[PDB]
């Protein structure tokens, strides 16, 4: 499409102008000597707006991909972030939101485009830095990019997502988020990242207050949690629980936040995702700790798990049966025949 080529050319030309400015701009001069390019003066927002709107259609995305659109839009977002930093300027915030939305659409279902954007490590660093923006709407857009990039990440993309500090940045972002729709995007990205490798799990667990926060996302008894929050927080917990099971300090954080009690409540949920997540978490936590095994026995876990072993869903069937096996292999003294007497 020639309008699309026309728009991408405009964006590329602006970026080039910005790079040439960055390379010529000398320290300690007047504001007037070598003026910064202003995207308003180059009609950039309306260009990226049109491309964002077009990016919702798969045929328009195909045309964009043939003309290098992902790279052009990414370079634009990056250069604006580098030039202007964490600004509250409405034009800049809007530009960044539209660019990020386009990048979300262009990385959806497209393994090649995910790999390409991850390879742009300078852009990736700029994206991660925007999670500290005062705009929770920009936070949501950035988290949505990172969510898509972390879904079906290839070996190199996983390494890069880790390298640029996306896990710590997202977890720290989560602790301060007030808007549910922003939190949903942030937790969905973390759910993907938490599955990539053990080091990502450790990085989540290492953020001060993060485990208590995550257990907080599980509760029904909340004026802020929605179903989506419970699902995604529980998914993160399921993934990181393989590590937590081996760390007494982290188990203690879970204990003191009533995690086992809440997971047993989750077994009774009508939500398949919630039950699934709880079965995987209990699989892990029911191993190798007598204190937690006894609490589970006291609260009736054995029967609650037995009821789920015939599920058609692998995670429920396997996780419930495995947690049950762990409890049956480690019967507390007070439930042994010789002690009930």
């Amino acid at each position: 499409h020639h309008h699309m080529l026309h728009l991408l050319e405009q964006i590329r030309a602006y970026c080039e102008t910005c790079w040439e400015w960055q390379e010529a701009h000398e320290p300690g001069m007047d504001q007037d000597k070598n003026p910064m390019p202003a995207p308003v003066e180059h009609q950039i927002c309306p260009a990226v707006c049109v491309l964002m709107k077009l990016s919702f259609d798969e045929e328009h995305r195909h045309a964009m991909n043939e003309l290098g659109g992902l790279q052009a839009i990414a370079e634009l977002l990056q250069v604006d972030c580098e030039m202007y930093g964490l600004t509250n300027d409405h034009y800049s915030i809007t530009l960044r939101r539209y660019a990020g939305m386009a990048l979300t659409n262009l990385t959806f279902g497209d393994v090649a485009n995910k790999a390409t954007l991850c390879s742009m490590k300078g852009c990736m660093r700029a994206l991660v830095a925007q999670l500290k923006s005062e705009s929770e709407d920009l936070q949501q857009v950035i988290a949505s990019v990172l969510r898509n990039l972390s879904w079906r990440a290839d070996v190199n993309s996983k390494k890069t997502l880790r390298e640029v500090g996306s896990v710590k940045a997202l977890m720290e972002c989560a602790l301060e988020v007030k808007k549910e729709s922003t939190l949903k995007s942030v937790l969905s990205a973390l759910w993907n990242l938490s599955a990539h490798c053990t080091e990502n799990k450790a990085d989540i667990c290492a953020v001060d207050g993060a485990l208590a926060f995550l257990v907080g996302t599980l509760t029904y008894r909340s004026q802020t949690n929605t179903l989506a929050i419970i699902e995604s927080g529980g998914g993160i917990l399921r993934n990181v629980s393989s590590l937590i099971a081996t760390n007494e300090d982290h188990r203690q954080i879970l204990r003191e936040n009533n995690c086992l009690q809440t997971l047993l409540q989750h077994l009774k949920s009508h939500s398949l995702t919630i039950v699934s997540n709880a079965c995987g978490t209990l699989w892990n936590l029911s191993a190798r700790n007598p204190k937690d095994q006894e609490a589970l026995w006291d609260m009736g876990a054995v029967s609650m798990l037995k009821n789920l072993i015939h599920s058609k869903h692998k995670m429920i069937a396997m996780g419930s049966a495995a947690a049950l096996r762990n409890l049956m292999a480690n019967r507390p003294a007070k439930y042994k025949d010789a002690n009930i007497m």
């Binding site: 964002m52 990016s55 979300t104 959806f108 969510r147 879904w151 937790l187 973390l190």
Partner: peptide, 7 residues
């Protein structure tokens, strides 16, 4: 956590 279009 899956993937999604923008909004």
């Amino acid at each position: 956590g899956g993937e999604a279009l923008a909004w």
